[PDB]
């Protein structure tokens, strides 16, 4: 566990750099097309004349945000012969 943690932190410390380069890319898009335009591209309701349009858009966002129940997979239990491990959830060999 300890070892893999110290791996994860490295990965993450890199992915925050990747995410930064992305956000930076987004900035360059901003000063190519102008800020407002970019906001338009991102779903800004500048075309909303009246509240009914707003409530349509937000009704859309509501129907997205509502979370359908997640069916989360549980790994099956593997029954081996003399059962060196009854923790066995995979077919890999283990060091007992």
């Amino acid at each position: 566990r300890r070892w893999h943690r110290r791996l994860q932190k490295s990965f993450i410390a890199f992915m925050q750099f990747k995410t930064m380069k992305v956000l930076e890319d987004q900035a360059r898009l901003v000063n190519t097309y102008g800020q407002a335009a970019v906001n338009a591209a991102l779903g800004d309701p500048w075309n909303a004349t009246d509240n009914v349009a707003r409530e349509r858009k937000s009704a859309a966002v509501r129907r997205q945000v509502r979370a359908l129940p997640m069916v989360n997979v549980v790994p099956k239990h593997v029954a081996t012969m003399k059962q060196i491990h009854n923790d066995r959830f995979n077919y890999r060999w283990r060091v007992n």
Partner: protein, 202 residues
């Protein structure tokens, strides 16, 4: 269409900030700002032309096909009466260059050089802005372009055709032309690589 996620904003990195006087939430139904900035002009242009966007000015001149700067310059010289004829074309060029990148032209390179040497030395401690200017102005040089070509060359960025082009660019020299163009210690490399250099840079 919407993302595969809907999240809140990513946290702000230490040292990172939204630039000053920059409206971050601005929408197209916001009222037009009064001044002329790349931002204000690009949002404006979005409202006027719709979604027409061009990488550079010559791309615009590509889309209009046969309309030179000065021709339009006459339209604007008509509209704003007190402008000159020169300032009328200038107005066009400045608007286009605000909506897109600045033009690449010998004229503007010359103007840049002329101002650079009209200012002279500066009171900066290490003559900082002058080393800035100098280091920049050599990026536009012939020799620099030749070097850029040799560098992309080293990375195998050409094809067979580029090669046969380089070859027959070489065959066109005489021993005399070699003796003259080897004086610069660079320019003969440019005579051979001219088309390929022009290809990478453009």
């Amino acid at each position: 269409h919407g993302n595969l996620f809907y999240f809140r904003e990513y946290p702000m990195y230490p040292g990172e900030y939204v630039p000053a006087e920059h409206n971050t939430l601005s929408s197209l139904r916001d009222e037009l700002r009064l001044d002329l900035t790349a931002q204000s002009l690009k949002e404006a242009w979005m409202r006027v032309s719709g979604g027409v966007y061009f990488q550079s000015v010559d791309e615009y001149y590509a889309s209009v096909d046969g309309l030179d700067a000065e021709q339009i310059g006459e339209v604007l010289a008509a509209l704003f009466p007190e402008l000159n004829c020169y300032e009328a074309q200038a107005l066009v060029q400045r608007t286009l260059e605000c909506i897109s990148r600045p033009v690449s032209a010998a004229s503007r390179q010359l103007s840049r050089t002329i101002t650079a040497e009209a200012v002279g030395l500066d009171n900066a401690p290490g003559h900082y802005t002058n080393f800035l200017e100098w280091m920049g102005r050599l990026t536009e040089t012939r020799a620099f372009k030749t070097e850029h070509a040799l560098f992309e060359f080293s990375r195998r960025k050409f094809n067979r055709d580029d090669v046969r082009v380089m070859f027959e660019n070489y065959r066109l020299m005489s021993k005399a032309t070699l003796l003259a163009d080897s004086a610069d210690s660079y320019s003969h490399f440019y005579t051979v690589l001219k088309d390929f250099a022009r290809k990478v840079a453009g």
